[PDB]
Amino acid sequence: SHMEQLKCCSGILKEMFAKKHAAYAWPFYKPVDVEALGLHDYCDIIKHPMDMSTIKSKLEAREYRDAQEFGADVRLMFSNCYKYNPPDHEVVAMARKLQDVFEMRFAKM
Numbered sequence: 001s002h003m004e005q006l007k008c009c010s011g012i013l014k015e016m017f018a019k020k021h022a023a024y025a026w027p028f029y030k031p032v033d034v035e036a037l038g039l040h041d042y043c044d045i046i047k048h049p050m051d052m053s054t055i056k057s058k059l060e061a062r063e064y065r066d067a068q069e070f071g072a073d074v075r076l077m078f079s080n081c082y083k084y085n086p087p088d089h090e091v092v093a094m095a096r097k098l099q100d101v102f103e104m105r106f107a108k109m
């Protein structure tokens with residue numbers, strides 16, 4: 001059931017937003033503020049920005065046909081972070097910790 005697997009996707013996103021993961025998930029909660037100092041080049045590098053609130057809205061608006069499409073947006077959000085930032089940036093390590101949560105849940109769904 002595609003409906004049931006999308007309910008699992010909503011459960012994975014709910015955990016990613018949970019207090020347990022907040023110490024490293026918070027940079028991914030909302031769209032990157034491209035007007036902040038140091039982010040003048042974000043829009044030139046990142047063609048398709050993505051964040052957890054936009055994914056939550058896409059789930060609510062039924063913009064994902066299946067778990068594969070939901071997973072693609074979660075992975076786009078982490079890939080944007082890895083592409084934009086230097087490999088030693090604090091946010092890259094936070095993205096890895098959050099991706100560990102996602103990949104384990106997504107694989108076992």
Ligand SMILES: CCOC(=O)c1[nH]c(C)c2c1CCCC2=O
Nearest residue numbers: 026027028032080081084085091
């Ligand atoms: C202080 C507020 O910065 C953020 O929440 C935030 N989130 C992500 C994913 C990023 C940033 C800033 C650096 C670029 C980046 O990849």
